[PDB]
């Protein structure tokens, strides 16, 4: 017997050129900005983390209020899009996810630290390819 | 930096006194019966778009037969996804809408609990497939199965 695991997907979603059709599952690490604009979440795939912007569109077309309290729960991102926040205060630009539809999963688990996906060299190369063509 | 795990849920679901209000992730172990897509217009080719697909799904602890409904199959997006399931064994399957049903003995096979899936999604994650006992081989499940049977 054993347990089923989720495999990383964030880095692949960013390096890919196509928009994610199928959904992605990851763990909710932190609620940066909860819902009352959408909400800002820190999501992990076990290997990397990414800030996800859950649009208002997604908050309305959802079952269910507020994400705080579900930290550690798995999260289904049904509608994703990789975007680029541009450099502002000293900090460079970063990739992030805009989520237009999501769904909470039952599995709850301890939260483990993970590096940000923008710290990955392949991701970084691609970022500095978007900025030098935008 | 760690492994994200999925919580076993099949035995707890069947024994619980209610239906899965929320989605559940599992792994496709085997394809007992794949499903063909519906083709408009007559043909001398056998049509089976009435039958849905039948999968053996694991949750890491137990396995359970899943009947992926026709509705579920046609309300799905098959972009860069050959309509079907063979080839996806080892992939994570998310049952977004389902329920526990009883199957009375028939055709040589004894009564058992199984899941009807009216909506699913395929996750990218692929993983090794570990031998796992069927949930119906569980003592408490069997006791409930017979309890259910004694109500027809």
Swiss-Prot record, chain A:
Disease per record: Dyskeratosis congenita, autosomal dominant, 6: A form of dyskeratosis congenita, a rare multisystem disorder caused by defective telomere maintenance. It is characterized by progressive bone marrow failure, and the clinical triad of reticulated skin hyperpigmentation, nail dystrophy, and mucosal leukoplakia. Common but variable features include premature graying, aplastic anemia, low platelets, osteoporosis, pulmonary fibrosis, and liver fibrosis among others. Early mortality is often associated with bone marrow failure, infections, fatal pulmonary complications, or malignancy.
Protein name (record): Adrenocortical dysplasia protein homolog
Modified residues (Phosphoserine): 22
Domain of life the protein comes from: Eukaryota
Region forming the signal peptide: none
Short motif PWI, span: 8-10
Quaternary structure and interacting proteins, as annotated: Component of the shelterin complex (telosome) composed of TERF1, TERF2, TINF2, TERF2IP ACD and POT1. Forms heterodimers with POT1. Identified in a complex with POT1 and single-stranded telomeric DNA. Interacts with STN1 and TINF2.
Full-protein residues shown: 4 to 155 of 458
Cellular location(s): Nucleus; Chromosome, Telomere
Role played: Component of the shelterin complex (telosome) that is involved in the regulation of telomere length and protection. Shelterin associates with arrays of double-stranded TTAGGG repeats added by telomerase and protects chromosome ends. Without its protective activity, telomeres are no longer hidden from the DNA damage surveillance and chromosome ends are inappropriately processed by DNA repair pathways. Promotes binding of POT1 to single-stranded telomeric DNA. Modulates the inhibitory effects of POT1 on telomere elongation.
């Amino acid at each position: 017997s054993g347990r089923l695991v989720l495999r990383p997907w964030i880095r692949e979603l960013i390096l890919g050129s196509e928009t994610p059709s199928s959904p992605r599952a990851g763990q909710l690490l932190e609620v940066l900005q909860d819902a009352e604009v959408g909400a800002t979440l820190l999501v992990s795939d076990g290997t990397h983390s990414v800030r996800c912007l859950v649009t208002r569109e997604a908050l309305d077309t959802s079952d269910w209020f507020g994400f705080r309290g579900t930290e550690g729960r798995l999260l289904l991102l049904q509608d994703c899009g990789v975007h680029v926040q541009v450099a502002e205060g000293g900090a460079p630009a970063e990739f992030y996810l805009q989520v237009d539809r999501f769904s909470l999963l039952p599995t709850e688990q301890p939260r483990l630290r993970v590096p940000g996906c923008n710290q990955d060299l392949d991701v970084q190369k691609k970022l500095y390819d978007c900025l030098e063509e935008h």
